[PDB]
Write a protein that binds this ligand. Structure first.
Ligand SMILES: COc1ccc2[nH]cc(CC(=O)O)c2c1
Ligand SMILES: COc1ccc2[nH]cc(CC(=O)O)c2c1
Ligand SMILES: COc1ccc2[nH]cc(CC(=O)O)c2c1
Ligand SMILES: COc1ccc2[nH]cc(CC(=O)O)c2c1
Ligand SMILES: COc1ccc2[nH]cc(CC(=O)O)c2c1
Lengths: 259, 261
């Protein structure tokens, strides 16, 4: 009914969900509660235009871009924090630790960004605001392209109906890849991941008894994340050339450096 | 229904061997232990052209004569040939032929490249790829050293086989994996996705079991194989990028050839 070996895997799933909760202020649970009128105090101010943008704080394409930027640098701090709590991560070769974060951080951001989205928009400012998908797509030419592919991923991905206990493990599976470019010692990274994969596969069947092959359907979504990161940079470098007076946080530049 | 899954696996494996000439097993016996003609440079290549008799990509007179361009030309003629091999195999997968015809064309349209490099990995090793029906062996260092963008074309695939082969999968596993790849419901333009996912669902179960029984020792192999699907996509997109970049070259009269390929 539950081997002694299974228990450890549950103990791990738990330890992880816990850190996830302590490292991320806005969980999917809260995001979903805010988004589905599950309240009168949790409901966000909606921004779908210029006047709404005005009321919001009470050109546009660029203030928003900068907002996303600092929110990311923020997230990178949250993820790193989370990373330190993954059994064995800190015990790894220091360099390898940096590589993992480098290549893992944006795939993790997109996964979690989805928790804050629905097909009409996304929560912003800790869930106090909600920016619509169409208003975002109308931003000045190049900028009107930053959010769409994310929105596109989010709809396919939210379809899996995963929750924070599921995500806490999947996020750790992402960081502990091993097929990342430039790893010195792969064997150790792979042993940790082999472990994380076990815990996620169990966590998924217990938590989604009816969902057939969710474990695999989930692991496949990983190709979608890479394509998102890949595309974002191509689009990010374009912005870098048109807008010469625009900057990209040093931390964020170190991530994208020779990715 | 484990007994139903092994039936699907055996069926796919049987169909797979009937559709593909050079298999992982067959190819792995070559690299290890009548060796293939080894091509490691300009002259050794010029030599193989008439020895390997892979003079199928050769008949076309005055259409390149440029070493680097001729090698690329042969990889296409061979890939077009492979696509027929893959299409036939796809038609073995239970339920495939019953999908909307438009959807069958689409699944194949977007799965071929991915499937090609997956099987190409069965033919290569750290040092080079086995070519011409296993007749020859084209070194990896010889390829990474071709002119214009050619000397960077194959290199990425070598990086991928190295990692993919690390999984030590065999034809039994590969047959099922190929089937999964084809039945991908995220292909753009699909009219009726439900049937496709239903099929890929039974395929994944079949694949999982297959790996649990075939490689008991391999922990979470199923998971690791699905993860390689992420690099395979990057490889295909990048590859496609080259094809539009390579469009900056001169590259039986072409009209018709150009049409077939
Ligand atoms: C305005 O929409 C955005 C834009 C960039 C972002 N980076 C990170 C997040 C939140 C999260 O990952 O939970 C985010 C939200
Ligand atoms: C996570 O989604 C987004 C969407 C638009 C963005 N613009 C700038 C960033 C910061 C980064 O490149 O990480 C960003 C992030
Ligand atoms: C197996 O990789 C290759 C090599 C040469 C090629 N020429 C044309 C295509 C298909 C396409 O039109 O994208 C192609 C694929
Ligand atoms: C494995 O990919 C390759 C690389 C170089 C090549 N040169 C000629 C061919 C066609 C053939 O095998 O007849 C070929 C295929
Ligand atoms: C049997 O599977 C395949 C699929 C695509 C291919 N492209 C080039 C080759 C080498 C060759 O066999 O000449 C090849 C082999």
């Amino acid at each position: 009914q539950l081997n002694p070996e299974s228990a450890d895997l549950r103990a791990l799933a738990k330890h992880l969900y816990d850190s996830y909760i302590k490292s991320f202020p806005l969980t999917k649970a809260k995001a979903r509660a805010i988004l589905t009128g599950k309240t009168t105090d949790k409901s966000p101010f909606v921004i779908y235009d210029m006047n709404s943008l005005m009321m919001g704080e009470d050109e546009v394409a660029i203030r928003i871009f900068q907002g996303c930027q600092f929110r990311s640098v923020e997230a990178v701090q949250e993820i790193t924090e989370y990373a330190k709590s993954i059994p064995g991560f800190v015990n790894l070769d220091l360099n390898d630790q940096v590589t993992l974060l480098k290549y893992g951080v944006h795939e993790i951001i997109y996964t979690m960004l989805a928790s804050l989205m629905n097909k009409d928009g996304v929560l912003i400012s800790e869930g106090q605001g909600f920016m619509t998908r169409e208003f975002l797509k109308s931003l000045r030419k190049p900028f009107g392209d930053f959010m769409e592919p994310k929105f596109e991923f989010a709809v396919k991905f939210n379809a899996l109906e995963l929750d924070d206990s599921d995500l806490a493990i999947f996020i750790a599976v992402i960081i502990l890849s091993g097929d990342r470019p430039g790893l010195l010692n792969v064997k150790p990274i792979e042993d940790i991941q082999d472990n994380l994969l076990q815990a996620l596969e169990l966590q998924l069947k217990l938590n989604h008894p009816e969902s057939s092959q969710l474990f695999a359907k989930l692991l496949q979504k990983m190709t979608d994340l890479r394509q998102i990161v890949t595309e974002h940079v191509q689009l990010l470098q374009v912005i870098k050339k048109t807008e010469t007076d625009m900057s990209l946080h040093p931390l964020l530049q170190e991530i994208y450096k020779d990715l």
